[PDB]
Amino acid sequence: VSLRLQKRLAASVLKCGQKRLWLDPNESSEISMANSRASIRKLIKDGLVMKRSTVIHSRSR
Amino acid sequence: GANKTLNMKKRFGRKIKQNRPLPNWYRYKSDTNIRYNSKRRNWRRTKLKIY
Amino acid sequence: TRGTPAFGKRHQKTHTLCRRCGKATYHKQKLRCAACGYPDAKMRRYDGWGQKVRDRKGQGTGRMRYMKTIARRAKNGFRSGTQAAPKVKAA
Amino acid sequence: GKTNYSREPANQAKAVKTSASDLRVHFKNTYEVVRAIKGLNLENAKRYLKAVIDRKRCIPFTRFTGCIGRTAQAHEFGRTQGRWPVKSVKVILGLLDNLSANAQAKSLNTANLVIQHGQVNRAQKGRRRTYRAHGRINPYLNSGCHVEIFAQEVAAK
RNA sequence: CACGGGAGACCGAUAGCGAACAAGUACUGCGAAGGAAAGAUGAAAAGAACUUUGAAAAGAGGGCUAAAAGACUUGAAACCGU
RNA sequence: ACGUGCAAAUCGUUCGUCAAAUUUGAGUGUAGGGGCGAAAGACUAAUCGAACCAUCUAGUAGCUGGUUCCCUCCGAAGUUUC
RNA sequence: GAGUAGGAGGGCGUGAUCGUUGCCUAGAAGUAUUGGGCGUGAGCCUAUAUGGAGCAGCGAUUAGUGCAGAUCUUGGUGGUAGUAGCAAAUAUUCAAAUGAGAACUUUGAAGACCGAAGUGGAGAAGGGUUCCAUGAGAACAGCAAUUGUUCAUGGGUUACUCGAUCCUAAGACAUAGGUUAACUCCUUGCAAUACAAGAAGACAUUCGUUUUCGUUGUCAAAAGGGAAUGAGGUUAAUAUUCCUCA
RNA sequence: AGGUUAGCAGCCUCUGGUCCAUAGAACAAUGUAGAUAAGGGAAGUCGGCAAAUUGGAUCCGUAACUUCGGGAUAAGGAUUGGCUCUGAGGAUCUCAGAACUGAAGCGGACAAAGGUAAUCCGA
RNA sequence: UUAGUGACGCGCAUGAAUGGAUUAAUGAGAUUACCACUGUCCCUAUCUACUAUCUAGCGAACCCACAGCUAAGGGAACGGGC
Ligand SMILES: [Mg+2]
Ligand SMILES: [Mg+2]
Ligand SMILES: [Mg+2]
Ligand SMILES: [Mg+2]
Ligand SMILES: [Mg+2]
Ligand SMILES: [Mg+2]
Ligand SMILES: [Mg+2]
Ligand SMILES: [Mg+2]
Ligand SMILES: [Mg+2]
Ligand SMILES: [Mg+2]
Ligand SMILES: [Mg+2]
Ligand SMILES: [Mg+2]
Ligand SMILES: [Mg+2]
Ligand SMILES: [Mg+2]
Ligand SMILES: [Mg+2]
Ligand SMILES: [Mg+2]
Ligand SMILES: [Mg+2]
Ligand SMILES: [Mg+2]
Ligand SMILES: [Mg+2]
Ligand SMILES: [Mg+2]
Ligand SMILES: [Mg+2]
Ligand SMILES: [Mg+2]
Ligand SMILES: [Mg+2]
Ligand SMILES: [Mg+2]
Ligand SMILES: [Mg+2]
Ligand SMILES: [Mg+2]
Ligand SMILES: [Mg+2]
Ligand SMILES: [Mg+2]
Ligand SMILES: [Mg+2]
Ligand SMILES: [Mg+2]
Ligand SMILES: [Mg+2]
Ligand SMILES: [Mg+2]
Ligand SMILES: [Mg+2]
Ligand SMILES: [Mg+2]
Ligand SMILES: [Mg+2]
Ligand SMILES: [Mg+2]
Ligand SMILES: [Mg+2]
Ligand SMILES: [Mg+2]
Ligand SMILES: [Mg+2]
Ligand SMILES: [Mg+2]
Ligand SMILES: [Mg+2]
Ligand SMILES: [Mg+2]
Ligand SMILES: [Mg+2]
Ligand SMILES: [Mg+2]
Ligand SMILES: [Mg+2]
Ligand SMILES: [Mg+2]
Ligand SMILES: [Mg+2]
Ligand SMILES: [Mg+2]
Ligand SMILES: [Mg+2]
Ligand SMILES: [Zn+2]
């Protein structure tokens, strides 16, 4: 089961870089079923696809 | 690139159509020796002339 | 370097397609086609010069829309205005 | 693709034949796996090939010696050099399996099959290219296999 | 030279026009110009039903047919295996 | 270093110059005994002390190489003259 | 009774032609032979196997008539050899899933790299469907592959405001005139080596009529000049183009 | 884009991208690349080839020669961290002092000239 | 010190824009010292990565009369063959 397309679409939808995407490992088949973008947004709304917090870069020092 | 003549577009279209494989049912004719289309072409290995 | 590293620099193209003969023989800087010479307005080919040419481009090389039937109707006397007629003689 | 085996068995109800043709495995390697199988019990051949695959045993190199590694495993043979040409072994093994399943319809017993006549032939070489310095090109090919093996039943008194 | 006719102590698929074949074609060259390789299953597809082992290619059974002649007529030598 | 390359000129270190006689895209002017040259007989599509393509052209070769079946018989010259 | 260079006399073997005598689906040619023989030798006859349609002798006629070589032509193959080798560009690892098969596919979890002079986001030249989706046997992706820039099938490129199209440049080419056996060649924006070459208006609204002013062409810039658009949303693949709003 | 910095250098990072370059194991000679050698210091070699030394900034100090522009970072001599205070320059971030503290180290990586004296050419 | 520099000059064969003599700046331009410096050397050792190694997979090329142990001898005056 390749999710390549899932991930690209999810990226665009979330207006974020692919490496920020998180596709739930457990629900993967379900995700593979998403074809259209719309499917993707439903997916994100449902919580199967999420968007990772940015890598923390701090100015303390 | 992006920018093209009509002539170009049409020529490219032509060669694009001509680049199909022999239709699988032609090989069943009684008078033909043709197993395949010998004239097929791949953009990477052979280049057209358009300028 | 005259070699491989040199070849990278070739994106120019000195010829384009000649309306008349349709190869890329057209010289935009000289305004002529190296093969036919499209502007010249009579076909450029040197026959004695070198011998193969006519069999590549030349009369009979591509389909001849008009001439093929000329052979046939040459013998038939160039009929104009005639219609074929039944041997059965129906009136 | 109709196999003509160069050698024939004496009793063909008492024999089992396998052949595979136009394989992609290395000739010399296959050759020597086979050469090593000749004259054993089908069950033995299978055990020992499986053992080569598991690296606990070596397939002796006989005809094609060209710079082949010396192993302690070659003791079993009287030899210095041998290897573990896995691909070849797997293919051959598959062939032995076809031998055994090939015995089924015959209603023959496995225990008394002995291997006589392995035949490995150099098949038509598959062709491709290699780019060489100065803009030369040289051939890069593979030497394919034809294999055939038949098994006789021999009764042990 | 073109379209026709007929013919030959010609040639007979490395011969004969370069081309017996989607041949001035595939392909190369900015270009002028260069330019090949490639013909024969059988009288008829009857082009291999079906069983079995294989993930699959395929093997073993079994069958067509005068014959497998099965991607194909004959099938030499060099080379290689038994 | 590589030198049957990654490469028919590359790779590592190192080095010349780095706001001008600087670098650079396209378009446009110059073509073969002709161009073009801060001049090296340099460059002119891997071709240059005269490009490339076809033709005269199977160019001529007192010179190099090859010159295809059997047997039997006779059997030389390396000297003379120009 | 020697013999290179060389010469002579006889003979062997190969096409095709005119004759003559014949052989072959009751198996010709060709091919293989550790079968049997014939010639001093070119070569021959037979046997067996294969083969599955044509052959052969004798007398002449004719010749693209005999190959070990020419760094000979074209094609096919060896030994070298499972050898040289697959080592630039810091890096991978774990579990799950999928599959006949996973170091090389997908998710997640870790560790590193390019470090905004990028291994990022978009263009011009060049490429031309390489883009998108689904599927996948062989081949190719110099290990591998369940993966692909590969194969098969279908589908994708919407504009008054972006660019071409218009303008002029370095330039260039017609026309006219002249040169050439002819082809060709020479001039032309400061426009002519040319010149009875144009434009506009109105009424008319055709002509015609009429009036006015007048020497005569075109091509060359997808970085130059250059009338006006934006944000938001949408597709698997297009969008300053489609949708919505302004 | 952030940090360091004279700096769009180098080195490290965030956004975005990527781990693609066939793999496993052994660890000999020879090799390719990378470093370090006690005592001496070019004796090596056609030749200091290669390597080594030098390197920033602040303060000192600076010849012959000259076309008076130059030479010139000439040559050479010192300093550089951390920490705790002090003073001066401005609107309605630079500079200087003092004291304390360490294996006397401190341009700690990165970055970064080795000099001198002659001879020959060509400005 | 056949090296470098300064002098002398019976200059093989120096000499005036076929330029002669000078010369600051200047140089990836020729040469000689010296200072610093050092694995260039005495004199060679050790450490890292990639190779060579071995393995799974993949897999060329040069070249090749015939081949491959020597001593002498003779021989187209250095044989592998006699
Ligand atoms: Mg284009
Ligand atoms: Mg290409
Ligand atoms: Mg090409
Ligand atoms: Mg045609
Ligand atoms: Mg025609
Ligand atoms: Mg076979
Ligand atoms: Mg290579
Ligand atoms: Mg079968
Ligand atoms: Mg048969
Ligand atoms: Mg043999
Ligand atoms: Mg370099
Ligand atoms: Mg002479
Ligand atoms: Mg003939
Ligand atoms: Mg019969
Ligand atoms: Mg006879
Ligand atoms: Mg028979
Ligand atoms: Mg005769
Ligand atoms: Mg012959
Ligand atoms: Mg021969
Ligand atoms: Mg070979
Ligand atoms: Mg290498
Ligand atoms: Mg990369
Ligand atoms: Mg990019
Ligand atoms: Mg992009
Ligand atoms: Mg102009
Ligand atoms: Mg002009
Ligand atoms: Mg505008
Ligand atoms: Mg609009
Ligand atoms: Mg390794
Ligand atoms: Mg020392
Ligand atoms: Mg010293
Ligand atoms: Mg010392
Ligand atoms: Mg040095
Ligand atoms: Mg001064
Ligand atoms: Mg100083
Ligand atoms: Mg000085
Ligand atoms: Mg202090
Ligand atoms: Mg102070
Ligand atoms: Mg102190
Ligand atoms: Mg220091
Ligand atoms: Mg020095
Ligand atoms: Mg100079
Ligand atoms: Mg000395
Ligand atoms: Mg002296
Ligand atoms: Mg100097
Ligand atoms: Mg091991
Ligand atoms: Mg191996
Ligand atoms: Mg001697
Ligand atoms: Mg000897
Ligand atoms: Zn033309």
Side-chain angles (χ1 to χ4, degrees), chain B residues 9-21:
Chain B
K9 262 225 173 192
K10 289 187 192 168
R11 298 254 202 163
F12 287 104
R14 174 110 159 176
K15 296 288 172 156
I16 277 189
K17 303 179 197 172
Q18 304 186 341
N19 202 25
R20 73 157 294 176

Side-chain angles (χ1 to χ4, degrees), chain B residues 19 40-48:
Chain B
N19 202 25
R40 268 174 128 238
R41 155 196 66 86
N42 163 29
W43 55 268
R44 203 121 146 137
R45 291 187 172 204
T46 289
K47 299 293 175 160
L48 318 149

Side-chain angles (χ1 to χ4, degrees), chain A:
Chain A
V1 170
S2 94
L3 299 178
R4 233 46 206 151
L5 161 84
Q6 326 309 333
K7 232 175 196 184
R8 182 216 349 171
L9 298 168
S12 155
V13 166
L14 296 193
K15 308 185 185 186
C16 106
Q18 287 211 0
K19 61 145 157 192
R20 257 180 126 193
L21 299 178
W22 175 85
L23 304 181
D24 185 345
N26 289 336
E27 294 277 308
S28 48
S29 41
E30 172 78 2
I31 296 168
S32 75
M33 287 202 80
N35 296 322
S36 73
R37 284 166 185 273
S39 302
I40 300 266
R41 318 162 211 210
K42 183 170 174 184
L43 267 183
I44 304 162
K45 174 173 195 169
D46 283 335
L48 291 204
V49 168
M50 297 181 66
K51 175 168 152 186
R52 308 175 183 208
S53 45
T54 316
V55 201
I56 328 99
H57 188 57
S58 157
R59 303 200 81 235
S60 337
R61 314 178 209 91

Side-chain angles (χ1 to χ4, degrees), chain C residues 65-86:
Chain C
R65 311 181 249 181
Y66 188 63
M67 313 222 53
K68 34 206 201 182
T69 46
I70 275 168
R72 141 181 121 211
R73 72 174 171 164
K75 90 179 175 184
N76 290 341
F78 297 93
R79 328 188 186 195
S80 275
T82 319
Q83 205 65 337

Side-chain angles (χ1 to χ4, degrees), chain C residues 10-13 28 31 40 42:
Chain C
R10 339 163 74 226
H11 53 280
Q12 283 185 26
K13 279 152 178 223
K28 352 184 199 189
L31 296 171
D40 288 307
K42 105 231 177 199

Side-chain angles (χ1 to χ4, degrees), chain D residues 1-4 21 146:
Chain D
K2 299 186 155 168
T3 298
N4 300 321
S21 57
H146 291 324

Side-chain angles (χ1 to χ4, degrees), chain D residues 24 26-29 64-67 83 122 128-132 140 143:
Chain D
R24 203 140 196 219
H26 276 355
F27 172 83
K28 341 245 208 175
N29 293 326
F64 308 81
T65 310
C67 326
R83 262 168 193 189
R122 314 238 186 145
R128 59 197 175 156
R129 294 185 162 195
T130 273
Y131 298 109
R132 286 292 205 62
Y140 208 65
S143 19

